[PDB]
Amino acid sequence: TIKLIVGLANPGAEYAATRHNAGAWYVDLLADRHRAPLREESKFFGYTSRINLAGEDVRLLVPTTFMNLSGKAVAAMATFYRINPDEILVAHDELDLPPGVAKFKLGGGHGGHNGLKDIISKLGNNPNFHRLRVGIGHPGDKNKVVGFVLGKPPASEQKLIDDAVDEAARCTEILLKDGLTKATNRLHAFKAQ
């Protein structure tokens, strides 16, 4: 069961269009599709909502922390509602997947993502939460990652990411209603088959 879906972000209009906000794009779409608009809730350091997904009560969070303090919002909300790490799905931009691809993951490393690193920390050094990895591709120069994730994608890459986010939203209904195997069998086939 998933009780909390988190879309990682930096705050402000300055970052709303940047690759590092890709997880928030996903959560914004869930909010739109379930007619549950995200609104500031300062005790959880973010924007929150609540949706019915496949007959299950699921809370939404897009932090208003800087990305490196995402764990403060996720822990405050998870602790308040007595939600355990394994009941959290964290959506984030993923350098290791191309634009147009998304995958689910349970546990594993942060892939150098400053928001995942802070969540692992603030959940009690527990990496065993679900992730939605939204592919953004990688810069050619591994030195220039910050400039890349804090950049706006070109329109052709934005359209691919929007398509992957749309598919991941559709697969989230399946994840809640029929489980992680079924949701993964669909999502990981999206550009693979």
Ligand SMILES: [Cl-]
């Ligand atoms: Cl950052």
Ligand SMILES: [Cl-]
């Ligand atoms: Cl990762």
Ligand SMILES: [Cl-]
């Ligand atoms: Cl790219």
Ligand SMILES: [Cl-]
């Ligand atoms: Cl850079």
